[PDB]
Design a protein around this ligand. Sequence first.
Ligand SMILES: CC(=O)N1CCc2[nH]c3ccc(Cl)cc3c2C1
Length: 116
Amino acid sequence: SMSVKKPKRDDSKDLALCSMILTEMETHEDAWPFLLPVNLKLVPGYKKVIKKPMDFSTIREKLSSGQYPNLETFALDVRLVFDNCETFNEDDSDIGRAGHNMRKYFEKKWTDTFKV
Ligand SMILES: CC(=O)N1CCc2[nH]c3ccc(Cl)cc3c2C1
């Protein structure tokens, strides 16, 4: 509260570390569904159903331009990619599997980097 803060957890390297995680995300073999925004003119249903589209390129641009106030808003956008993928894709599809795989890969990197 006013004049009462817990000790400052060091956040100076967060930007760089989130960038590194994102690079690892971008270069994963199963990232292909997520690299660019879904083409809303070419994918029937997507626009109406998915209220907040997100993709890796959009996250990279937001990151590079200071649009994440903190590491948690970054993780919210990453998770949004996978949440959308689950909303739109059957688990037993290539893309549904890719999303589960990428979520798993992300969350380990996330824990190991910021919670281990
Ligand atoms: C991620 C997802 O729900 N999408 C919607 C379905 C879909 N199909 C694709 C084929 C090729 C590429 Cl590169 C991406 C896609 C997507 C993206």
